[PDB]
Design a protein around this ligand. Structure first.
Ligand SMILES: Nc1nc2c(ncn2[C@@H]2O[C@H](COP(=O)(O)OP(=O)(O)OP(=O)(O)O)[C@@H](O)[C@H]2O)c(=O)[nH]1
Ligand SMILES: [Zn+2]
Ligand SMILES: [Zn+2]
Lengths: 88, 46, 178, 111, 50, 361, 98, 49
């Protein structure tokens, strides 16, 4: 998960990465609009330096939603599962 | 940057970096929530 | 700022060809200290007073002299073995002599964290305490393999000249000290 | 059919198991008179371990080789003196000494 | 545990004893509010064990 | 760039469910519309893997196939995830790429399967002792280690060190002193969490006091868990022995476990001497088990003072006055030789030749 | 999970191969145990149905059995060997909610 | 090999687990010993209320 891409012009995150926290994960308590990313995920393309391409989880919705909780768990496969609870 | 999280049962503020085994001290529960933001959010009473 | 410690070579292994065929049967029959068993091994084991010297003579004239402590001692032992082979009734010669390997030992007189050493030089080290208590370091400088123990004693091997072992020890000393 | 010929063993805990690395060698130590007669056999024959093992029935050739290596590494002057001295090969007296050593080890076991 | 929107709705449903004749309607927009047409009520409650 | 103004401010903005790459300066639509399969197409299409579509799995021999099947069978018996299975098969193929391992022994390829499984287990910080692998692989430890060294020297892959705490937890989960079973009475049953924490503290103390370095870790883990089980209730466990504990827990007693326990008890006695009340009590290797807890409470300063006043094998701490004595350099070489008397005394006489012939007739 | 599983195990208690006679594998008794999770490193730990729902895992218990076989004509027995995992139904006899 | 073989080395513990997981998730049960091919046995519990 990549951090929020801060805009060098205003030194603040862009409108798309505005709801993301320092760790790139959207924090509860804020409102989510249409076409906004929740997890700035980036995965490698090889499977010499790894080449990561971004595949963020965008929110498709006509109306706004509020993040209530963001649970983060780790499975036996070292896989991180992140669940965001949107409320309307 | 110190990233803080809360446990599912202990409810204690734990600080962990990236790429670490999700665990909480004095227990073994593997449910970690994120604290609520500190930014100002406006709500409508309608 | 030298290290102040000098290793000690405990073994010098060198191959040498005689340039003529040999009859191991007669070589072992006309000698008292001869050890040879064709069904077990096809080499005659010869021994002389150069410290701990053992020559593995073969029928093709190739013989490996080991156990020596210096290149000059190894050469002397090889020449003595060649003279013995000649006296046994063969036209043996002393040609193509070159030091093949030298194993030495040294001590640093202080403990070493093998886990820290391997975490710092993993790509140049290997630590498996469940198999061998000694960490195995492989340096590319003189192509040297080192066995490092927790007690500080280090055994170096895989060199060709004493200078290679000396400079390898001088280079590895500050890494172990730090 | 197996008519109660074997007994069940409560081993191999399904949890896990460890390694041993030491299985069979389990050598047996020497003695003073045995080392003396071994140095005598060395002075009499040489370094060829085949004949030494053939003449020593109750000790293994691998153990003989280990002892010779240990002597070469620790006591070199003794090996030098052994090679300096020489004795013609004797067979009947050697068998008599072997019987004497058998009697000596029997008395030791009795003790 | 109460939702933020439900809490805001409940708070909006709470009446205020202020005299409306002494205030005026807020113009279009101006979320900052002016002293003539805005009233501020702070609510800070921290629950803890006795 | 934009075809009209030539600007490079092309942004992908979906306008009401319509993907469109449009310029941000003049709004010129560069490209619009995307073709994506629907639910019907996704359900009608069948999944085919690269193992079949690329062309592999055909240029493979029966030996490599048996090796892969054995790798998978062992990975499944150990209940390891499919990610571990995939990593293991990948490492096995990478090792088989070489010819020295390709044309090797049956035991060689068995140990290759074992070592690939071990490397896959280590790469994910997973604890797994090599003894269980050697037991479930039909191999001996000597050849196992030999082939492991050979393959690691031939490949050069990363070999993460076996973490101590993970192995501690894995070995503590084996003991049956958590639930009261018919055989084990209730007095021996103790608290899992507290005993595991005590064993973790003990093995950390051992790792910091130079006890696990150079020695097998599992005997130290056993000694630590035994000391913790005795300290959690020293009263009813003062007479219990190491062999008795092993018999009760149904665990193979390690041989050096006794030596590790004695060394750890000596370290605990040193910490007691460092402490004030304990050094006045004048405890011993049998009465320090009740105060082990007080030791671990502030083991930091205790170990610091103990090191102020290194741990090496007993064979080296016997007052090594002459460390590595300097041997007398003897480079005397003469001209080319010494004499022929040595050659004559080396040559076998006719009498000895005939004696050897008669003996070996 | 209490009677039918035992009856099936008794029906399939003995299995042997045609080649190399005198070899067999006899099951003595099968157990289901309590619900556990294989998350920890070779360690079992009680897991709740809510935790299972959260972590997107299965709420099952390790199926264990005791067996006896003949390796080299020497009868070797195993008192506890896992063979599978049976998803435990909530509010069942072995469930944690009951 | 002369090494005596035992089942513990091939007692696959994941077979039954995967079988049960699939039979409960997919819902399609195919028992060949009884020639029973059923579908829709398991359904997602409706948490609407
Ligand atoms: N709203 C809605 N309900 C459905 C739908 N399909 C099934 N259901 C409901 O759940 C049931 C049948 O789901 P299935 O058709 O069995 O799902 P499926 O066809 O087995 O999935 P496949 O095995 O791939 O064919 C019916 O009883 C419906 O009440 C659907 O497409 N929309
Ligand atoms: Zn907690
Ligand atoms: Zn443009």
């Amino acid at each position: 998960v990549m951090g929020p891409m801060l805009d060098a012009a205003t030194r603040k995150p862009i409108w798309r990465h505005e709801i993301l926290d320092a760790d790139g994960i959207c924090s509860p308590g804020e409102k989510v609009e249409n076409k906004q990313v929740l997890v700035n995920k980036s995965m490698p393309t090889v499977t010499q330096q790894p080449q990561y391409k971004d595949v963020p989880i965008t929110y498709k919705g006509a109306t706004d939603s509020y993040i209530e909780k963001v649970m983060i768990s780790s499975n036996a496969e070292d896989a991180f599962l992140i669940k965001m609870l949107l409320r309307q | 940057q110190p990233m803080i999280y809360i446990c599912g049962e202990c409810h204690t503020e734990n600080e962990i970096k990236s790429r670490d085994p999700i665990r909480c001290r004095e227990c073994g529960y593997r449910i970690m929530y994120k604290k609520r933001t500190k930014r100002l959010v406006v709500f409508d009473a309608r | 700022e030298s290290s102040g410690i000098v290793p000690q070579l405990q073994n010098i292994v060198s191959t040498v060809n005689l340039g003529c065929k040999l009859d191991l049967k007669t070589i072992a029959l006309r000698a008292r200290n001869a050890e040879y068993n064709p069904k077990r091994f096809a080499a005659v084991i010869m021994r002389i007073r150069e410290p701990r010297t053992t020559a593995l003579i073969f029928s093709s004239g190739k013989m490996v002299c080991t156990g020596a402590k210096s290149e000059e001692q190894s050469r002397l032992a090889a020449r003595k073995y060649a003279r013995v082979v000649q006296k046994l009734g063969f036209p043996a010669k002393f040609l193509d002599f070159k030091i093949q390997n030298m194993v030495g030992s040294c001590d640093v007189k202080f403990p070493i964290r093998l886990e820290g050493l391997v975490l710092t030089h993993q790509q140049f080290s290997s630590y498996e305490p469940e198999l061998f208590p000694g960490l195995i370091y492989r340096m590319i400088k003189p192509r040297i393999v080192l066995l490092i123990f927790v007690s500080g004693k280090v055994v170096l091997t895989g060199a060709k000249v004493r200078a290679e072992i000396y400079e390898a020890f001088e280079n590895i000393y500050p890494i172990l000290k730090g | 059919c197996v008519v109660e010929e074997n007994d069940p063993i409560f081993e191999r805990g399904s949890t896990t198991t460890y390694s041993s690395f030491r299985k069979n060698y389990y050598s047996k130590p020497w003695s003073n008179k045995e080392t003396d007669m071994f140095f005598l056999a060395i002075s009499m024959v040489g370094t060829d371990f085949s004949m030494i093992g053939q003449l020593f029935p109750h000790r293994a050739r691998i153990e003989i080789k280990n002892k010779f290596k240990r002597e070469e590494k620790t006591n070199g002057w003794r090996i030098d003196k052994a090679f300096q001295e020489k004795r013609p090969f004797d067979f009947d007296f050697f068998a008599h000494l072997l019987q004497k050593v058998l009697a000596e080890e029997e008395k030791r076991k009795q003790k | 545990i109460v939702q933020d929107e439900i809490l805001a709705h409940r708070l909006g449903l709470i009446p205020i004893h202020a005299d409306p004749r002494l205030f005026e309607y807020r113009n279009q927009g101006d979320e900052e509010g002016t002293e003539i047409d805005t009233l501020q009520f702070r609510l800070q409650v921290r629950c803890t064990r006795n | 760039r934009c075809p009209d103004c030539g600007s490079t401010e092309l942004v992908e903005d979906s306008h009401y469910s319509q993907s469109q790459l449009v310029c941000s300066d003049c709004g010129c639509v560069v490209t619009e519309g995307v073709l994506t399969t629907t639910f019907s197409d996704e359900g009608n299409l069948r999944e085919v893997t690269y193992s079949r579509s690329t062309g592999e799995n055909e240029q493979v021999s029966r030996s490599q196939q048996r090796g892969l099947r054995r790798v998978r069978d062992l990975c499944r018996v150990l209940q390891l995830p499919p990610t571990f299975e995939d990593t293991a098969v990948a490492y096995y193929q990478q090792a088989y790429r070489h010819s020295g391992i390709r044309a090797a022994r049956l035991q060689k390829k068995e140990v290759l399967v074992g070592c690939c499984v071990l490397i896959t287990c280590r790469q994910h910080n997973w604890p797994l002792t090599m003894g269980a692998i050697c037991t479930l692989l039909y191999a001996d430890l000597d050849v196992f280690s030999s082939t492991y060294m050979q393959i690691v020297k031939l490949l050069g892959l990363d070999v993460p060190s076996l973490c101590l705490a993970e192995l501690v937890k894995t070995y503590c989960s084996s003991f049956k002193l958590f639930q009261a079973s018919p055989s084990v009475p209730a007095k021996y049953v103790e608290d899992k969490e507290k005993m595991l924490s005590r064993t973790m503290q003990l093995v950390e103390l051992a790792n910091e006091t130079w006890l696990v370095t150079g020695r097998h870790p599992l005997p130290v883990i056993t000694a630590a868990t035994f000391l913790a089980w005795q300290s959690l209730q020293p009263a009813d466990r003062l007479s219990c022995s190491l062999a008795r504990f092993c018999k009760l827990a149904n665990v193979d007693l390690p041989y050096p476990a006794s030596s590790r326990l004695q060394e750890l008890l000596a370290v605990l006695l040193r910490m007691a001497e460092q402490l004030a009340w304990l050094r006045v009590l004048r405890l011993d290797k049998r009465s320090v088990v009740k105060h082990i807890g007080d030791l671990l409470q502030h083991r930091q300063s205790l170990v610091r003072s103990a090191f102020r006043d290194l741990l090496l094998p007993p064979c080296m701490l016997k007052s090594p006055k002459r460390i590595c004595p300097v041997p007398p350099v003897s480079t005397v070489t003469g001209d080319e030789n010494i004499s022929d008397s040595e050659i004559e005394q080396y040559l076998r006489t006719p009498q000895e030749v005939r004696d050897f012939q008669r003996a070996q007739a | 999970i209490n009677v039918e599983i035992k009856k099936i195990m008794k029906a399939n208690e003995k299995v042997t191969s045609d080649a190399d006679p005198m070899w067999y594998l006899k099951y003595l008794n099968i157990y289901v145990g309590l619900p556990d999770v294989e998350e920890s490193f070779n360690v079992t730990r009680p897991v709740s149905p809510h935790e299972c729902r959260l972590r997107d895992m299965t709420y099952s218990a390790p199926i264990t059995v005791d067996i006896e076989y003949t390796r080299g004509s020497q009868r070797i027995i195993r008192n506890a060997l896992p063979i599978g995992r049976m998803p435990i139904m909530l509010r069942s006899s072995n469930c944690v909610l009951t | 090999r002369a090494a005596q073989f035992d089942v513990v080395k091939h007692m696959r513990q994941d077979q039954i687990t995967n079988g049960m997981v699939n039979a409960i998730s997919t819902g399609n049960w195919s028992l060949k010993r009884f020639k029973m091919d059923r579908q829709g046995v398991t359904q997602v519990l409706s948490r609407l209320s």
